[PDB]
Each structure stands twice: as C-alpha cells, then as structure tokens.
Ligand binder design. Structure first.
Ligand SMILES: O=S([O-])[O-]
Ligand SMILES: [Br-]
Ligand SMILES: [Br-]
Ligand SMILES: [Br-]
Ligand SMILES: [Br-]
Ligand SMILES: [Br-]
Ligand SMILES: [Br-]
Ligand SMILES: [Br-]
Ligand SMILES: [Br-]
Ligand SMILES: [Br-]
Ligand SMILES: [Br-]
Ligand SMILES: [Br-]
Ligand SMILES: [Br-]
Ligand SMILES: [Br-]
Ligand SMILES: [Br-]
Ligand SMILES: [Br-]
Ligand SMILES: [Br-]
Ligand SMILES: [Br-]
Ligand SMILES: [Br-]
Ligand SMILES: [Br-]
Ligand SMILES: [Br-]
Ligand SMILES: [Br-]
Ligand SMILES: [Br-]
Ligand SMILES: [Br-]
Ligand SMILES: [Br-]
Ligand SMILES: [Br-]
Ligand SMILES: [Br-]
Ligand SMILES: [Br-]
Ligand SMILES: [Br-]
Ligand SMILES: [Br-]
Ligand SMILES: [Br-]
Ligand SMILES: [Br-]
Ligand SMILES: [Br-]
Ligand SMILES: [Br-]
Ligand SMILES: [Br-]
Ligand SMILES: [Br-]
Ligand SMILES: [Br-]
Ligand SMILES: [Br-]
Ligand SMILES: [Br-]
Ligand SMILES: [Br-]
Ligand SMILES: [Br-]
Ligand SMILES: [Br-]
Ligand SMILES: [Br-]
Ligand SMILES: [Br-]
Ligand SMILES: [Br-]
Ligand SMILES: [Br-]
Ligand SMILES: [Br-]
Ligand SMILES: [Br-]
Ligand SMILES: [Br-]
Ligand SMILES: [Br-]
Ligand SMILES: [Br-]
Ligand SMILES: [Br-]
Ligand SMILES: [Br-]
Ligand SMILES: [Br-]
Ligand SMILES: [Br-]
Ligand SMILES: [Br-]
Ligand SMILES: [Br-]
Ligand SMILES: [Br-]
Ligand SMILES: [Br-]
Ligand SMILES: [Br-]
Ligand SMILES: [Br-]
Ligand code: NA
Ligand code: NA
Ligand code: NA
Ligand code: NA
Ligand code: NA
Ligand code: NA
Ligand code: NA
Lengths: 137, 137, 137
C-alpha cells in the first residue's frame, strides 16, 4: 500500500497537534478548527477593554477614565503581564476646552498609571472624561 | 486496510471545512490556504482607513480630519457595527500651537463623532488638521 | 483502494504548502505548525517598538520620544515600507502641564516625522517626554 506524499496518494497518519513539523502526515480537521478559532483573539468589549494581538504578546487596551483632583490611578482593564509600553488619550467634551492629558509613564505599574487632566496655568481638574488607547505586553 | 490515527498510517477522510472537531480525519490543503489567507485581515490603506483585528470583532480606524468652525462630524472610514469604544488624536502642524483635540464621545454614533480643535481661551478653530486613531466594533 | 473524500476514507496526498486550493488532498501537520506560528506576529517589545498586524500590511508602532528645542525627527522603530498613516501622542509628566504634542504629518518620511512639544504662547520646549502610538504600512 503506497505511503502518502505530495506527489502520490497513499496511507497517512493524522496528527492532532499544532507543534509537529512532520511534512508527510496530515493535520487533523480538528486542528484546522483550533487554528480558525484562534483568529478570535482574546478580548473584552467593555467600555474599558482590551484585545490580545494574536500570540505576539502585545495587548491593546482602551477606556474612558474620569479625572480626579490629583494625578491618580487609571486602572487597566487587564493587568499587563510585563508592562505598559505606550498610552495616548484625549478629552471628551462638547465645549472648546484645552486640557493637558498627562500620564506619569515613569511610575506606571502592571495594573495602573497615574493620569490627570491639567488646566492651563493651574493644577489638576476633576471630573474630566478622557478616552485613551494603550499598548503593552 | 488500516484506519489513520496519530500512531498508525492508514486511510482517512479529507474534510474541507474549518468547523469540524474530528481528530481522526485530515484537513484539506484548501482549508490550509483559507486559514493562511485569513491572516490578511480586511482593511483599507486609505488616508482614513481601518483594519479588522482578525475575528475578534475589534476594528482599528485612523485618519486625518480637518476641523471646522464648530465641533462637527468626523465620519469613520467604516461604520462600526456596534460602537466606537475609544479615540485619540493630535494636531498636525509645523508651528508650536497648543490646540485642544476634543471628541464628544457621549454623542458618537456608529458612523461619526463630533470633533473639534479648541483654542486656548476661545472657541473652535477651523482648518486644523488632526491625525486620529480609534478602536471599536 | 478508495480515494479519500469528505464522505469516504481512502488514500490521499499530503501537501506541504499553504497556497493550494486542492479540496481532496490533506494539509501536512507541518503546515498546521507554520499557521500556528504565524499568530506570533513579527514585533519588537523595545521601549520604542512595533507589531505587524498579521499579513494585512498594517504595522502599529509606539515609543517614547524626547523633545528638543525645535520640531525635530522622531525616528520610527521600523521604517514603514510605504508610509505612516496616523500618529497620536501625549505628554508624560507628574506635573499639571498643558503642552501641544504636534506632528508635521505633511512632511513625514518612511523613517521619521517632525515632532515637537509646544508651550502655550511660546515656542518649542526641549526635554519633554512624549508617549506615542502610530499606524502605517
Ligand atoms: O494639546 S493640549
Ligand atoms: Br489525489
Ligand atoms: Br494526537
Ligand atoms: Br498543540
Ligand atoms: Br514547536
Ligand atoms: Br521546526
Ligand atoms: Br519546529
Ligand atoms: Br520543533
Ligand atoms: Br489571542
Ligand atoms: Br468598563
Ligand atoms: Br464614564
Ligand atoms: Br476628586
Ligand atoms: Br490614586
Ligand atoms: Br486605586
Ligand atoms: Br487582570
Ligand atoms: Br480653554
Ligand atoms: Br514620565
Ligand atoms: Br513592576
Ligand atoms: Br507592578
Ligand atoms: Br516588577
Ligand atoms: Br477640579
Ligand atoms: Br508516516
Ligand atoms: Br466538504
Ligand atoms: Br468552514
Ligand atoms: Br463550531
Ligand atoms: Br468543539
Ligand atoms: Br466544536
Ligand atoms: Br462544534
Ligand atoms: Br479579517
Ligand atoms: Br480617505
Ligand atoms: Br487632508
Ligand atoms: Br468651517
Ligand atoms: Br456636523
Ligand atoms: Br456630516
Ligand atoms: Br461603512
Ligand atoms: Br499656542
Ligand atoms: Br463625552
Ligand atoms: Br445607535
Ligand atoms: Br448610529
Ligand atoms: Br443604536
Ligand atoms: Br477659525
Ligand atoms: Br473516518
Ligand atoms: Br510539498
Ligand atoms: Br506555502
Ligand atoms: Br494563492
Ligand atoms: Br483559489
Ligand atoms: Br486560490
Ligand atoms: Br490559486
Ligand atoms: Br507577522
Ligand atoms: Br527603544
Ligand atoms: Br526615555
Ligand atoms: Br535641544
Ligand atoms: Br531633526
Ligand atoms: Br535625525
Ligand atoms: Br527599519
Ligand atoms: Br500649564
Ligand atoms: Br501636517
Ligand atoms: Br517617500
Ligand atoms: Br522616505
Ligand atoms: Br518615496
Ligand atoms: Br526649552
Ligand atoms: Na511520488
Ligand atoms: Na507520508
Ligand atoms: Na493628545
Ligand atoms: Na496505532
Ligand atoms: Na482516522
Ligand atoms: Na463517498
Ligand atoms: Na481525494
């Protein structure tokens, strides 16, 4: 009975893993399904949420933070396994305000970063809504 | 004639779908191609464009918006099926201007968000270019 | 000896490529591994780094830029093969400063973009840390 190859039909094993480099055995249909399902990256669609970028390790997070009277903790939807790498954010308003959205990246932790809404000339402002986007791993 | 398994070469079905959990039949080469092609996530490379993050549902969008004399509609390259979740943006300039890039997230729709360029002390400014990045689903 | 199909077990070829649309031959286990490994998108976890969004062509980059006395070059971690499409960024501080994070997108190149930290009323400020996020291809 012939052995299966690229050029000749024959008998073959069917392997049910994604870490075999055997060029001469078939992948199972089940592992095709596992691979397809992996495109549905782990995520949360919450107001403040996250999405894992495949198996790269990178995680994008986002949310709406409400400022307080000091530069205070913005708590990530998902703790970063390693670190926040970068973050950006903007005022959410229906009035023409110029507010400094300032992040203390130098003291960020795996779970939070100090975030504030600065007034021109003055100190931190409370009650400002800030939409932010971050990446880390 | 032996039946194919992980340990014994034999005869097998070849399944041409990505939603079978059959561990004992082969996936077709054709579905390997479908899976490979799925890494080319749906997207637009336009100045204002988007990219779908696999099958997670999340969509990143970006663009260059030109401000008007009021906080006015920034129209997303792709309508969000559900909602915009977060957005950020910056002035594009070659002069040292401080302008408040302000988004009315509270009244965003699936197709647009009111966006303006605020002057310190005064109202909305027209003709300012704003590069933005958003995520939603 | 029966030929493998979706409905009948039989003999089959085993193909070791990801660009065959043959519905009647098996994909190799090895190509299942290649596909799985493709979820680990090419990236750098450096302070200023990047991640490729699968095979879509889109690349997200991020970093921490230090401003100088003029609007000066922010050098991307990875040269864009085509162009930067959008960029955002924020001051990193522990003090309530309002600084204009301004990008000259109109003169960006594949390798850099002129970036500055503007003072209200005055010119560019040196020594300001800016965390940024970009997308392009
Ligand atoms: O730009 S505050
Ligand atoms: Br054949
Ligand atoms: Br197995
Ligand atoms: Br596995
Ligand atoms: Br391996
Ligand atoms: Br290998
Ligand atoms: Br290997
Ligand atoms: Br290996
Ligand atoms: Br994932
Ligand atoms: Br939430
Ligand atoms: Br809220
Ligand atoms: Br408070
Ligand atoms: Br706090
Ligand atoms: Br807290
Ligand atoms: Br967590
Ligand atoms: Br103002
Ligand atoms: Br900092
Ligand atoms: Br730590
Ligand atoms: Br920590
Ligand atoms: Br630590
Ligand atoms: Br206040
Ligand atoms: Br074998
Ligand atoms: Br079929
Ligand atoms: Br299917
Ligand atoms: Br299913
Ligand atoms: Br299942
Ligand atoms: Br299932
Ligand atoms: Br099922
Ligand atoms: Br897609
Ligand atoms: Br466009
Ligand atoms: Br334009
Ligand atoms: Br106008
Ligand atoms: Br409008
Ligand atoms: Br409109
Ligand atoms: Br649309
Ligand atoms: Br100014
Ligand atoms: Br709002
Ligand atoms: Br709605
Ligand atoms: Br709507
Ligand atoms: Br609705
Ligand atoms: Br104006
Ligand atoms: Br069978
Ligand atoms: Br081959
Ligand atoms: Br190939
Ligand atoms: Br092809
Ligand atoms: Br085809
Ligand atoms: Br084809
Ligand atoms: Br083809
Ligand atoms: Br990649
Ligand atoms: Br770096
Ligand atoms: Br630094
Ligand atoms: Br300098
Ligand atoms: Br320079
Ligand atoms: Br340079
Ligand atoms: Br490079
Ligand atoms: Br200030
Ligand atoms: Br510009
Ligand atoms: Br060029
Ligand atoms: Br260039
Ligand atoms: Br060029
Ligand atoms: Br200075
Ligand atoms: Na042969
Ligand atoms: Na074989
Ligand atoms: Na900003
Ligand atoms: Na066996
Ligand atoms: Na079998
Ligand atoms: Na049959
Ligand atoms: Na066949």
């Amino acid at each position: 009975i012939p052995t299966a190859t690229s050029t000749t039909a024959g008998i073959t094993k069917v392997l049910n893993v994604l870490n075999s480099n055997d060029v001469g055995s078939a992948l199972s249909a089940a592992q095709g399904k596992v691979l397809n399902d992996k495109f549905n990256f782990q995520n949360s669609k919450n107001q403040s949420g996250y999405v894992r970028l495949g198996d790269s390790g990178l995680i994008i997070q986002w949310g709406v933070f409400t400022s307080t009277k000091t530069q205070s903790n913005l708590i990530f939807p998902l703790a970063f396994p390693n670190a926040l790498l970068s973050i950006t954010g903007n005022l959410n308003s229906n009035t023409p305000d110029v507010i400094g959205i300032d992040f203390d990246l130098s003291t960020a932790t795996k779970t939070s970063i100090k975030t504030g809404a600065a007034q021109v000339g003055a100190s931190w402002l409370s009650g400002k809504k800030i939409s932010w986007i971050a990446i880390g791993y």
